[model samples]
Target: LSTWQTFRRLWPTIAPFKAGLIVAGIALILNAASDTFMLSLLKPLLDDGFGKTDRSVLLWMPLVVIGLMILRGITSYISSYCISWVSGKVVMTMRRRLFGHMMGMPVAFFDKQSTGTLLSRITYDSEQVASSSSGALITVVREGASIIGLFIMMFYYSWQLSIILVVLAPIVSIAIRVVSKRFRSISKNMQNTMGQVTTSAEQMLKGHKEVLIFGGQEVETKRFDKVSNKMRLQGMKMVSASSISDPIIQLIASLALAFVLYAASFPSVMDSLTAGTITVVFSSMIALMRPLKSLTNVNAQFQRGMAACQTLFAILDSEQEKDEGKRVIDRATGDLEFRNVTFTYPGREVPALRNINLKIPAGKTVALVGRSGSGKSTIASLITRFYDIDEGHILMDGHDLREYTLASLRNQVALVSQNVHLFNDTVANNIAYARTEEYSREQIEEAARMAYAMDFINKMDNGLDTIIGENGVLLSGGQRQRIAIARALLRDSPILILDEATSALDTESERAIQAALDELQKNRTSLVIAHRLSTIEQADEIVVVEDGIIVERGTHSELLAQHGVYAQLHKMQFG
Candidate 1:
């Protein structure tokens, strides 16, 4: 993704606001035309409007010229103001869409990507695109249109000099073409380096305490220095290339001027070129030169914009989770079954889950006991339809999970993972996310009590109105987990999954949370994944999974009597 490519892609977004763009364009053209027209008056105002002119002619003409100058000033202001206003709106629209699309992506998609990189795309990448749009458009209009009009005026006044200038322009064009290609490549690298830098800085800031505590400052700083160096080199390449262009073009222009002056020495040539005409022509040529320089510089800006576009489009084009099903299931009974199920992630040789067959009846607590990487989490993830099964169908209440709309299917199951997140908002808002207005104040309070969060809520300054800091950093881990549980309790879904719910907890917090869990498990069909077998010793049925296969299933006492994998796991944990 080069800068030029980013601008090209973003042009389509600008198209929708064509009315604003056109008004801005018209303002630009008017300023260019008026400015060029005013410069041409220099010849007339001096040679005709002033020289040997009657006193009245000189006085009135000066007034008229002044009026025109004022008008041109107005037009220039309009040009700048309108374009800037339009660009702001365009950026706003783009920012909204970028945020929506990024958030809509699947958990897996985000897992494989970096948060800082994603933030850069929305914040920095889009901002770069906006700047390029403004710079490119402003230069093209103000400089470009003025240059074209002035060049035409120059040619009309003296064709020989104009011809000389036009013939030499190919050289400048060649320089620009060669440099622009390199600029685009360098700009792309610069944007990617920025993403890397953002990622590194983000990590450094997020773990500042750890870095200091573990004496990792040196390593982290060295790593950040490398990223900074890479970004610097890419930016330097753009600067070096751009720096070479100006002097080269200026030298060429100076050579052309010298040639023109030498040719102007001829009597015949001198006769054809009037002193006034030559002066005006010189002014036009100087005016035209500014635009040509801008044109040359725009190449790099365009390249940078194009690079940003490629980065943004890469995410838009990547494979997203599917939502192809049209049928919508309004309700579900929570009867779930996995038959001959096998699953594998992209680019993996082995399946995460394999040849599994199981049925979870409605309204029962089914606990899954497995060591890490034993497909315990994967099974729960499938029922929630976070990732589609690579092979085999998941049935919910006799309906294929895929047949129901993605939104509808998700509405049926509520999951509270071991890792919980609380938004940077009021505690009530976080808990209400599951079913906001559907739960009254009384209902919300009841749900909080059920999750063992009511006590904390009562103690807080504003109760439910208290704003939890970002990711609930102001709260304890147990408080955050209980907040999440409260959110799920509010959903009141038919099927519930508490995955390693108490794994990370201390003895006191786990006991308090387990009490809430026992109450919530009364009616809903629940799947519990726990490392500690004792946590689920009273489950209706205990299923022990090993190596992606369910090796044993029975009551806690029955599994112990069999003295197989479950019994061995119990011995290891108990001992």
Candidate 2:
């Protein structure tokens, strides 16, 4: 959207602060009125008040001048405080709105967005929006009033001479038009480069361990410098336009002043011009330059802010994760079936799953065994509906999964994947997560015990109340996996998904977890994706997937008899 359209688009957010905005506008007008009144006083102060030192006008006049200044001071503060208050509230609201909107976005939407760029939007772009909505607003209102009042004074003193300055208006506006277009374009690039800087720095900061271990300091430093330089150059470009435009506009004003002075020297103009008239007119013209310069400078900041609004609004307008189903299910019978389901990830030409068929009746454990990237994990993602299938239907509890509300459908399934996501919180809170208020300390401990995480958790100083670092950074790989397992255990959903759940555990811990795992799988339909053959030996049925299709399905011994893909995989693992 253009700058004016984007400004109007934000009216909804700004509408709530109308009271503050109105007060700010009134204060700014008062401020400008005081300044203009002081200039008006100059005619009397110079013509009459100055010479009458013995007259009572001297004593009362100085006091009135001071009173005007005090009024200006008071109005300035009120305008500044109210505008800042409004801007702060506006930015905070936008940050929260952007975050909530992003949370509801689909997984594929994130695939096309960088984490750092998104972070910059919620951080840097918001600051720009506030700058545009805050101080720039004050400048436009107060300085604009000053310009209007000073122009009136100028005409009151000498309309014929003021016509000279008015004639130069076209040049002034044309220069502003050309420079403002440049400002808008550069400001857009400036915002984009800021996002790039954040993205590059985020990569280096998160990959600090890899950079040091692999001796990539020089490579990373060069790459970071390259990204950093692009932003600096953009900053310099914006400055060049601002700096050059200011002096050029000032020169135009100066030429108009010179023309007015040269024209005043004429006998015709001088015959009518009095000392007070020339003083007031010339002073008002010079005073007009100050506010005009400020407005020009403020124009750049406002343009930059408008550019940020464009990007942020783009994200806000993006489609959210779609949920069409109205049926709400508290619990499912745990029957799952994939009927000729085919799925492809966004931006990928090849289907991740092709015409795949599978079933896991309630109370049965079905294992999916395959090499890495052989669609084993893809099947688990589909069961959870992370990505909807491109063709055919996936049924859960004898009904198509889409027929159930997304939230209710997902409520019955619990997942513990290899890469577990944990929050920075007390151990009990992390396990309980969103349902912390619903579960007691004892229940959380019981689930931790079942998942074998209680061993290390109890050893920690605070036990269940201990605070873990972000994403369980303080915990080892196996410990993190156990915490995830305990969380899923506490969920107690009828359908469980374990995707390489024991991959990070040592052989001894893996053996210990198998005991609890066996009990957890009982009376629940399970979909286990495992690279390790031994983990699924006791599963009710096993399916071998390769290259997006199921190549073999049977019990372990039955697969061995067939000596096909599953047989070959088992032979390699067992031998």
Candidate 3:
């Protein structure tokens, strides 16, 4: 959307606070009245109260000027306070709405964008919205009112001279319009380059240890410099345009002032012009110069803000995840079936999973074994409904997975991924995660023990209370994996998925945790995706996949007897 279009769309969000805006406008009007009234007093003070002033006129005039100054101060405060209050509320509401919309976007939507870029939209772009709606609006209204008051005073004295200002007005407006367009273009470019800079820096900081060990300082530094330099150039262009516009507008005002002076000196013009009237009109015209220049300069800020709003509105209006399903399941029976399921990731030509039929009855364990890119993980993702199947059905207890609400569907399954993630929080908090209300401290501790994490967790200074660093960076790979397992255990869902769950563990630790894993899978419908053949040897049935197609299905001994792909994989690992 263009700036004005986006502003009009956002008006409803701000319309509720029109009372604050009205109060602010009233303050501005009072302020302008005080300024024009004080300027008007200049005429009376000079002609009546100056040289031959009676004591009463001098005293009363000086008192009147002080009283107007006090009134102006009160009006200024009210104007500033009311406008800022309205603007603050506007920013808060936009941020809340943006964040809520962001939470509902599909997983595919996030796959196409970078984290740093999305974050910049939320933080930096939101600030620009506030600038245009609040800061720019306030400046325009205050300066506009002041300009109107000055023009009224000028007209009261000499309407003929005011004609010069009217003629030059269009020239100043044209210059402002030209500069505002440039400002918006440059501002948009700046936002993009700034996102690139943030992305590059985020990568370097996140992988700082790798960069140091690999001697990559120079390369990373150059990458960051290139993006930041582009941002700096854009910023410079915005500044240059803004600075040049003020002087150009001021020059036009100065030319008009000169013409007014020249015209006033003629006999015909001066015949009706009193000394007091000339002074009042000339001072008001000069005072108009400052506000006029300010109005022109403020256009740059307005345009920049509009550019940001355009970017933000795009996100706000983008498609959200489709959740039209009305069915709600509080507890699934854990019987999962994939019937002729076929799937492909977004923007991919080839299917990731093709013509797959699989089922695991309640309380049964099924294993999927495959090469790295051979659709094992895709099956897990589909079962969890992270991505809808391109063809066929995924059913739990005879009902299609899509029949259930998303939140209810997710609550029925627990997942432990190959890449374990933990927040920078206490160990207990990490283990409990979203299940804190469902699981007590004792239950969390028990899960940690079952996952073989208690030994290392106890060694830490604060045990369960210890604050882990970001993503559990303070822990070893095996330790982090154990925390994730404990978290999954705390959920205790009927359907459990373990994707390379023991990939990080040593042989001894793996054996120790295998007992806990066995007991955990005993009464649940479990889907295990594994590269290690040994992990799935005891599964009720094993399916071996190759190149997005299931190549074999049997027990470990049955597959070994057939000497198929599963047997070959077993031989490679065991023999």
Candidate 4:
């Protein structure tokens, strides 16, 4: 990540809290000064206050120490609380903006991304950035000031001894630098290795039954152990590197101390080398080590935050789903026509839909019948303009979908597909969600009654108010299907796309669903995408589709008499 560029991008979010940050900075500087002043008091205490019975000296010394401690406590608290307030607000805004942008993304955008990765960006990466932005920065600024203050104290007491320590400083830094550099690569490797561990565990958890039935216990156990072992090794390497540098650094410090003591033996140096002076200069040098190490540690955290900023900025910058169409009408007439439309899914060369033409007048049923991957679902998606056509046009009544407002176009249609997405909420809430405010209680119950869902729903303890699990996980497949149907039925869109909505039903359930579906299509333009020829037998027109093109079209009797692809598929199923 480009450090300046990332910080510049982050500036907008931080700019709003500039006053809080400035106050925090001033407090942090004062906190560092108090720490140094407390250390500086060591000289007076040792030389005059210690082993003295003078009442004035004893009174002033302890009182001054107590005052300084209180000052340190107050300044540190303000610095911590203010920065936390600013950084927390920053993360919240970033998370909210990212979520809003994600919700607006086109369905095609989701097709190429991973659910887990996107989740981590919002939850994990954002929190890491929060810590990096404030926690790490606080350490850098506060520790940096403390180190500078302590060094000034050392030089003031004895530049002669300080010079020896300074001369040896470069050597100790070389070791710290060498150790820190190894950690960067080691940390990167550990992250990759940990991701593998998570992936393996996630797959096993989701497919627990698959593993047990397939006798994959040993194979999976071995696979997990491999990644786990790699992670353990990385952990050991970091500890070992840290351990080696510590003792080596201590040895250099000890050597520098000996040189300072030897140099002090000279008459010129001895004149100023009081017990208090020796302690202040050497103790302050030791103090320098902690802040120096901490400041270096901040580098990693600062870099991580910068990298996270770049990731978030990239997502924010990506073009959102274009909703440039201006035409907005109350409701479409339900007359639909496809004229030479051609389309391919994003990132694939092969067109999922090839050029063809079809027409469904208002209040008509068109059944698109085909095998898997035969473009049945593709046609239904185009009706709602999930993907704009690669060529030609899909028109509602007469105007192209691109000419209408996206919300208006989607509002004119209702979708109930094989994959039913449900929130964890009460049955009544699920069916009448957005319409809950728009619907009367009686209207909510009637939609469910029409879909044959009221039987099971009423049996539940709270009737329509019964709470369903995520995506209706607690419900039987057939029961879940009915809830979805009720939702679409209540929508009363001008057009309905039922894409394999009845696939999960058994014979008895299918019969019930058929009646509900009949009621659903009463005044709507219906596109029934299906493989079962039995359900679509009553369709006004049965269009046989294969390999992205329409191969045949006619009423059930008309197509049966012709004996084309539709008839062949009918024979395969009905025979």
- Which lDDT values do the candidates have, in the order given? 0.76, 0.81, 0.79, 0.81
Considering every candidate listed, which one attains the maximal TM-score? 4
Q: Worst lDDT window (10 residues) for model 1?
A: 1-10
lDDT of 2 by residue, 51-140 (tens): 553466666788989999999999989988988888888888888898999888887888787977778767888888888757788888
Q: For model 1, what is the error of residue 63's alpha carbon versus the real structure, in angstroms, after optimal superposition?
A: 9.5
Candidate 1, residue 103: how far the Cα is off, in Å: 4.8
TM-score of each: 0.74, 0.77, 0.74, 0.80
Predicted candidate 3 versus true structure: per-residue lDDT over 483-561, tens digit per residue: 7778778887888998773465444466656766776787888898865455678889999899999989988899889
Worst-scoring 10-residue span by lDDT in model 2 = 501-510
List CA RMSD, all candidates: 12.2, 12.1, 12.4, 10.7
Candidate 1 C-alpha lDDT tens digits along 144-216: 7888789889888888767766776676567657766766776677677667666766665567888889999
For candidate 2, the per-residue lDDT at 452 reads 83
What residue runs in model 2 are displaced by over 4 Å at the alpha carbon? 1-5, 37-74, 157-277, 293-304, 501-503, 571-575
Give the clashing pairs for model 3. none
Clashes by residue pair, model 2: none
For candidate 3, what is the lDDT? 0.79
Candidate 2 achieves a global lDDT of 0.81
Displacement of the residue 234 alpha carbon in candidate 3, Å: 32
